[PDB]
Amino acid sequence: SIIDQNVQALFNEISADAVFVTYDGQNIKKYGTHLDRAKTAYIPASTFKIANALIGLENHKATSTEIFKWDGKPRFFKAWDKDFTLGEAMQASTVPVYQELARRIGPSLMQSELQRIGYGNMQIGTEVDQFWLKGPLTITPIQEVKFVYDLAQGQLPFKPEVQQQVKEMLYVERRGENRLYAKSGWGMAVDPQVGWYVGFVEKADGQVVAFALNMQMKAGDDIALRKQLSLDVLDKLGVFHYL
Ligand SMILES: *C(=O)[C@H](CO)[C@@H]1N[C@@H](C(=O)O)C(C)(C)S1
């Protein structure tokens, strides 16, 4: 109860509309400045890389050790003018690498797969390398936590080793034997801009707590806030304490 209060007091800083959803395989809990956001579907943005990677590896469109060579065309961030493996690109949010992946998957296979796994509204439109960045694909924060919780538990409808590979692409840090897995997202090409920070905390016992920060974004917002806010919540909840 007071834990739940200590979490809300963090959201007093946050002028933006936000929601923080947690899941432990039984109960969904909601926190933030605007709770209806948990039931609302938004474009997945870079959080789709999780599903994309899974779909690609499952269908032999790539390997986890394969290197996606840079084409020489300067990308949106100078950081992306480089060669990447799916894991390195996952950490760096290298959009062009996953665009290449989506193109290799193709629109037919991408459609059937998203339908098979029930990922959000399962709509891709006509551009197989754009749907997650500008719609029509949408997904709710509740759908994100249930999806990412299953990845943690190896319960998604994919090969164990495929789920394993994508899981470790999301690894951030550990404290004791509690491990933090996460993925950030910023739907920059839509009004309103959507900000994501989706993941889970794996406690060595075997118990997992999946999480999903979903908030309103604006031009010029601090890129580090989403993660930082999420860690501040995970600390106050007792799921992932600071040192
Ligand atoms: C994916 O959500 C975007 C591409 O539009 C990339 N990821 C962002 C993020 O996770 O913070 C970015 C601002 C690095 S760009």
UniProtKB/Swiss-Prot annotation:
Upregulating conditions: Expressed from an upstream promoter, P(Aba2), in an insertion sequence, ISAba2. Expression level is positively correlated with gene copy-number in clinical isolates.
Post-translational modification: Carboxylated on the epsilon-amino group of a lysine, with the resulting carbamate functional group serving as a general base. Probably N-carboxylated at Lys-49 at neutral pH in vivo and undergoes complete N-decarboxylation, at pH 4.1, in vitro. N-carboxylation at Lys-49 probably increases catalytic activity under physiological conditions.
Residues binding a beta-lactam, per UniProt: S46, K49, S93, S184, W186, R226
Keyword annotations from UniProtKB, A to Z: Antibiotic resistance, Cell membrane, Hydrolase, Lipoprotein, Membrane, Palmitate, Plasmid, Signal
E.C. numbers: 3.5.2.6
Annotated phenotype, changing F76Y: Similar catalytic efficiency to wild-type with respect to penicillins, oxacillin and imipenem
Catalytic residues (UniProt): S46
Catalytic activity: a beta-lactam + H2O = a substituted beta-amino acid
Gene Ontology terms describing biological process: antibiotic catabolic process; cell wall organization; response to antibiotic
GO molecular function: beta-lactamase activity; penicillin binding
N6-carboxylysine carried by residues: K49
Cellular location(s): Cell membrane
Activation and inhibition: Activated approximately 3-fold by the presence of 0.1M NaHCO3.
Enzyme class: hydrolase
Membrane topology summary: Lipid-anchor
Assembly description: Monomer. Dimer.
Similarity remark: Belongs to the class-D beta-lactamase family.
Classification via PANTHER family: BETA-LACTAMASE YBXI-RELATED (PTHR30627:SF6), PEPTIDOGLYCAN D,D-TRANSPEPTIDASE (PTHR30627)
Described function: Class D beta-lactamase which confers resistance to the beta-lactam antibiotics, including penicillins and oxacillin, and moderate resistance to carbapenems such as imipenem; in the DH10B strain of E.coli. Acts via hydrolysis of the beta-lactam ring. Has benzylpenicillin-, oxacillin-, cephalothin- and imipenem-hydrolyzing activities.
Official protein name in the record: Beta-lactamase OXA-58
Gene behind the chain: OXA-58
